[PDB]
């Protein structure tokens, strides 16, 4: 009659064996079955590689007059509670769900034996909502917050005002063109500082809430620069608090990682996936691409339109940096010639900047794009794409900025003609003077031309590289280079910016049809004919662009993000579900 | 001269209708695969057209890349006749 | 209901005398296109690996520069 305790850590004498993790016996059982599952999926198994490079043709081909709208089995799982999942109606789903780390699919019978191929669930947020509902996730996050003794320094008010930032349909698209012109460069922001000092000031005056929260590098420049009393104190306070939550949460995760090392490198990249550098942030302005080829002991493959880029010894062949703008003064006209007389389809070159060797482990951008903005705002944004030549003709063929003898400190609304900038600035209703629009014109010397999407293909870490299918050991991911991400649009915005922006629903948190159907009138009919596709969990996305099974974030992450109430408990749950399911992750979880 | 019939199941003699002697055809998926592969074929129709202009311009650029070292060689080989 | 043709060895295909002659010509025009693309990208890789030979030979010739 003693009270023998039974924690988690006593169970790690059997929860860390590899025979929990090798599905070879499971696939040898499922392939040697006398009867396979009859209903097949064939929607987003393999990321087929696009031969072209521009992302507008992929989107406009994937959604013209499309009638058959499938849905994956992973979105079929997380669309129903626990009880009916265990009901015998859904034996066609329970024939597959048979391992907590592997969601085995059947694929196609293209060859002879349709083999049960098994992709791996990396993080614990990939568990289906029937077997782990949202309440369990947020209560687990509440255990996590007192596990690391976190000090959540954001109130409710910042979360709800950044929530109705994205839920505002009247977001000024002038902020989109300002972000598309700046696109995360320090020396570029030192140009347009008194511009955004006027923009977010008149937006804070306009509707109470704040703007420009749709980019990490932008709010990072807001916290770093621009505290010089140009904005009101309450507007700067929201940005500084949002910057503070990320570094507090990352100190919390680094507390969860503890003080242990494997080999010589630390263990933070094995237990949590945010501290894993091989996860990539979904917006890449700066160079990060050479960095994860240099720091990863595992072997990643940066796939840009069936170009492998497996080694950094042929690194400048695939990607060139633009560096600072003052280096390129001998190459301005050469870059313009590569703009105009360069066939950008069948062009596998990437135009980026430098890899800033910042003290934030390419991870502050990662944590803000993956834990905050999809959960304070319920994953209700889509990745748009810009054409920089079109915004340059927008921002420099106008009247007053071209003359250079119309002076600086005057109105721009009176003296410009009725171009796209005119009605773009009407519905925005801000008054940026002439001259501070001139550096927006001036950045075009060193902006790139297109919003290319690169499907990065990183291999898994050492803990779960036990799949028998060697091409299925790795977990693919896409990242929309050189474009920002955008909140809700109006039809008035689409009527003036149909020549400017095109949506790319590329990520799990960032492929949302309720926003992408506004600014892109091909999916607007696709959801009009198939109205069930409007949930973020089940929306069709291009398999040549985004592979739903081969992804770090499956459908239940989006389901939780779209149904969590935006508050502190939801944030702590969302950073609680980014923890991987390694045995080392189990060890660093049972320590805490 | 064929015949028409609804169904049967599980034979041993071969030429008897069954449920395993039915070819398993889904019409909509095959039409979808056929249409998308026609468009891949139609893109493959227009591919080997104008790399000859790229061949002539690459001959031009290797010409202008040889002419620079042709300029450099005799100039580098005249700066050795001042040593006496 | 739905009616299925009975399995017998006197069942006919839908007779095709004319649709095979143009067929292999379209096949040859497609496969020459594919083989030319494969040889083009192959020669692209071949010039890429051949150019590093002359870069190595240039850095081998540069030894005589280093004492001059």
């Amino acid at each position: 009659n003693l009270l023998l305790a039974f924690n988690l850590q006593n169970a790690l004498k059997v929860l860390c064996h590899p025979r929990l993790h090798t599905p070879a016996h499971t696939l040898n059982s499922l392939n040697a079955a006398p009867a396979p599952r009859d209903r097949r999926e064939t929607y987003s198994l393999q990321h087929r590689r696009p031969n072209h490079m521009n992302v507008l043709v992929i989107v406009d081909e994937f959604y013209d007059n499309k009638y058959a709208a499938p849905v994956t089995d992973i979105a079929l799982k997380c669309g129903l509670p626990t009880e009916d999942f265990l009901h015998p109606s859904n034996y066609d789903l329970l024939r597959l769900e048979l391992h907590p780390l592997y969601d085995i699919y059947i694929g196609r019978d293209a060859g002879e034996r349709a083999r049960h191929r098994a992709v791996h669930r990396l993080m614990v947020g990939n568990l289906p909502t029937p077997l782990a509902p949202a309440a369990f996730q947020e209560a687990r996050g509440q255990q996590f917050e007192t596990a690391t003794s976190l000090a959540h320094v954001v109130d409710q008010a910042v979360i709800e005002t950044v929530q109705d930032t994205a839920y505002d349909t009247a977001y000024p698209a002038f902020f989109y063109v300002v972000e598309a012109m700046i696109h995360g460069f320090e020396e570029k922001f030192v140009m347009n500082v008194p511009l955004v000092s006027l923009c977010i000031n008149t937006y804070w005056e306009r509707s109470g809430r704040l703007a420009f929260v749709n980019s990490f590098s932008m709010i990072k420049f807001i916290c770093r620069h621009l505290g010089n009393n140009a904005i009101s104190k309450e507007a700067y306070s929201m940005y500084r608090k949002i910057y503070g939550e990320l570094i507090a949460l990352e100190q919390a995760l680094m507390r969860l990682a503890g003080s242990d090392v494997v080999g010589d490198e630390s263990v933070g990249q094995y237990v949590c996936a945010l501290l894993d550098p091989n996860l990539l942030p979904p917006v890449a302005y700066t160079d990060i691409f050479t960095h994860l080829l240099t720091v990863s002991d595992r072997a990643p493959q940066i796939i840009i339109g069936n170009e492998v880029y497996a080694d950094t010894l042929a690194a400048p062949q695939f990607i060139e940096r633009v560096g600072n703008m003052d280096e390129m003064a001998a190459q301005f006209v050469a870059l313009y010639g590569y703009r105009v007389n360069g066939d950008h389809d069948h062009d596998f070159r990437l135009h980026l900047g430098p890899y800033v060797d910042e003290g934030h482990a390419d991870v502050l951008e990662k944590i803000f794009y993956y834990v905050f903005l999809p959960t304070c705002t319920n994953a209700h944004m889509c990745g748009l794409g810009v054409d920089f030549q079109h915004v340059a003709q927008t921002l420099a063929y106008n009247g007053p900025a071209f003359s250079h003898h119309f002076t600086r400190d005057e109105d721009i609304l009176d003296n410009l003609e009725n171009g796209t900038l005119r009605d773009l600035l009407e519905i925005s209703d801000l008054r940026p003077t002439v001259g501070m629009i001139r550096d927006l014109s001036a950045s075009f010397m060193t902006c790139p031309t297109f919003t290319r999407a690169v499907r990065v293909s990183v291999d898994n870490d050492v803990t779960q590289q036990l799949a028998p299918n060697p091409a299925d050991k790795r977990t693919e991911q896409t990242v929309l280079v050189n474009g920002l991400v955008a909140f809700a649009f109006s039809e008035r915005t689409r009527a003036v910016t149909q020549c400017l922006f095109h949506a790319i629903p590329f990520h799990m948190f960032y492929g949302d049809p309720r926003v992408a159907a506004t600014m892109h009138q091909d999916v607007a009919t696709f959801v009009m004919r198939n109205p069930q596709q409007r949930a973020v969990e089940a929306f069709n996305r291009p398999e040549q662009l985004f592979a739903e099974y081969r992804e770090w974030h499956r459908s239940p992450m989006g389901k939780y993000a779209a149904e969590c109430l935006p508050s502190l408990v939801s944030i702590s749950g969302m950073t609680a579900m980014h923890i991987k399911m390694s045995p080392m992750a189990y060890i660093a979880q049972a320590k805490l | 001269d064929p015949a028409r019939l609804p169904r049967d199941t599980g034979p041993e003699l071969m030429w008897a209708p069954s449920l395993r002697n039915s070819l398993r055809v889904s019409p909509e998926a095959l039409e979808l695969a056929e249409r998308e592969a026609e468009r891949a074929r139609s893109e493959r129709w227009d591919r080997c057209a104008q790399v000859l202009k790229n061949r002539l311009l690459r001959v031009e650029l290797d010409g202008i890349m040889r002419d620079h070292l042709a300029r450099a060689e005799e100039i580098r080989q005249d700066l050795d006749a001042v040593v006496a | 209901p739905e009616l299925m043709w009975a399995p017998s060895l006197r069942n006919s295909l839908r007779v095709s005398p004319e649709a095979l002659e143009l067929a292999e010509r379209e096949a040859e025009r497609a496969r020459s296109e594919r083989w030319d693309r494969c040889a083009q990208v192959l020669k692209n890789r071949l010039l890429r690996v051949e150019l590093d030979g002359i870069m190595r030979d240039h850095l081998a010739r540069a030894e005589e520069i280093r004492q001059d």
């Binding site: - | 690459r58 290797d62 040593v83 | 150019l51 520069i65």
Partner: peptide, 29 residues
């Protein structure tokens, strides 16, 4: 003895310009 410096930095600069033009080829194709 000023003939072993200026012409030498000249040929070094041209030996870098030819690698720059090979990189310009790799920019082209």
């Amino acid at each position: 003895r000023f003939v072993s410096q200026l012409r030498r930095k000249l040929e070094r600069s041209t030996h870098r310009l030819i690698a720059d033009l090979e990189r310009l080829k790799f920019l082209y194709l």
